[PDB]
């Protein structure tokens, strides 16, 4: 009806007016959704579509059932997004047809960049190889990046300092600037897997164990003593599945590893802007 053509028209005018509004917050989805099928969508054909573990930038709220935002991927058009409420409905109306974990996790508007490997942090080889990358980033993305240290154990996400650091990370990402964390306690992807930080794990992967072993020897007797715990840490990371990391710096030349990481962060920047 007539009053329906105005609502849809206006709904669509709210959708476009929001096209350039600030990113209120972000969510990582825990379920898939096919909005192109959702008939109740305020505007036929404006429903977002996403698989589980995707990221969404919420611009504004339309109603209790719908938000307005977009998928965090290049060419991510603004759209209507079902709220946890509406998703719950849908989850139940598909339950009755067969004869609690939330649909969304609120995450930082920019996923925290975190480095792991080639081995244990605290030792010269890993610390220096990662230091070289932090310096490169401080330079390549100067003007739109924040690189900060976190000594608090984030994998716990003292429990007060941890909370305070979680909040600090959210604040840093609010401006949509790149956020890189030099987190001393994170040596393995699984240590952040159950947090709500949804980091961009960058694996600095040394080709072979023989090589890493010789890099350690290059450091001197002091480092060589802790040879066994560095090699084990290396084995654990290497025994991890690919999907466990977002970026795998595979190259043996620093500048190539840097360009790899930069290309990736540049695609991310376009995706979030």
């Amino acid at each position: 009806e007539s009053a329906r053509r105005e609502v849809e028209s206006q709904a669509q005018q709210q959708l476009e007016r929001a096209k350039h509004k600030p990113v209120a917050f972000a969510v990582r989805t825990n379920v898939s959704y096919c909005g192109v099928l959702d008939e109740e969508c305020p505007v036929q054909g404006s429903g977002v579509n996403f698989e589980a573990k995707d990221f969404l930038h919420i611009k504004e709220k339309y109603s209790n059932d719908w938000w307005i935002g977009r998928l965090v991927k290049e060419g991510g058009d603004i759209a209507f997004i079902p709220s946890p409420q509406r998703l719950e409905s849908i989850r139940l109306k598909q339950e009755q047809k067969a004869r609690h974990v939330p649909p969304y996790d609120v995450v930082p508007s920019m996923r925290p960049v975190v480095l792991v490997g080639p081995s244990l942090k605290g030792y010269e080889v890993t610390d220096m190889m990662q230091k070289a990358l932090f310096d490169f980033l401080k330079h390549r993305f100067d003007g739109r990046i924040s690189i900060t240290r976190v000594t608090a154990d984030l994998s716990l996400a003292s429990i007060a300092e941890v909370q305070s650091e979680i909040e600090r990370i959210f604040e840093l990402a609010k401006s949509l600037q790149l956020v890189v964390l030099d987190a001393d306690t994170i040596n393995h992807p699984a240590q952040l897997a159950k947090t709500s930080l949804a980091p961009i794990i960058v694996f600095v992967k040394v080709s072979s164990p023989k090589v890493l072993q010789r890099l350690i020897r290059s450091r001197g007797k002091s480092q060589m003593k802790h040879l066994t715990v560095q090699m084990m840490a290396y084995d654990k990371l290497v025994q991890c599945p690919p999907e466990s990391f977002d970026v795998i710096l595979d190259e043996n030349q620093l500048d190539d590893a840097c360009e790899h990481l930069a290309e990736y962060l540049e695609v991310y920047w376009r995706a979030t802007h």
């Binding site: 220096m128 890099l215 190259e251 043996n252 030349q253």
Partner: peptide, 25 residues
């Protein structure tokens, strides 16, 4: 034997060492 592994080791070592020395700056 397997002179390619030896070559590979020399290539990776040299690169990774330079990577480390660059951070020593």
């Amino acid at each position: 034997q397997k002179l390619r592994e030896k070559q590979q080791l020399e290539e990776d070592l040299k690169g990774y060492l330079d990577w480390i020395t660059q951070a020593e700056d």
